[PDB]
């Protein structure tokens, strides 16, 4: 067939990779989507909300 040669990194499992893989449940029909209130798309949105600061840590 088509000649090829493997490069370093073949057969490794990197926990932060992005590759396509076969589906174990072909042609599965997912439940229709619903717009639940309060969608969060970025953690900075959470970080920008106020929260009470425990300043009085006087050890007693």
């Amino acid at each position: 067939g088509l000649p090829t040669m493997n490069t370093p990194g073949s057969t490794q499992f990197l926990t932060s990779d992005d590759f396509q893989s076969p589906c174990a449940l072909p042609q599965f029909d997912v439940t229709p989507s619903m717009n639940i209130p309060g969608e969060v798309k970025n953690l900075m949105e959470i970080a920008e909300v106020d929260s009470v600061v425990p300043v009085n840590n006087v050890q007693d």
Binding site: T11, S21, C23, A24, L25
Partner: peptide
């Protein structure tokens, strides 16, 4: 290499 696969959204509810 380790085995791998993909799974769709398999919940009965919407989330």
């Amino acid at each position: 290499a380790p085995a791998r696969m993909s799974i769709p959204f398999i919940s009965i509810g919407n989330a």
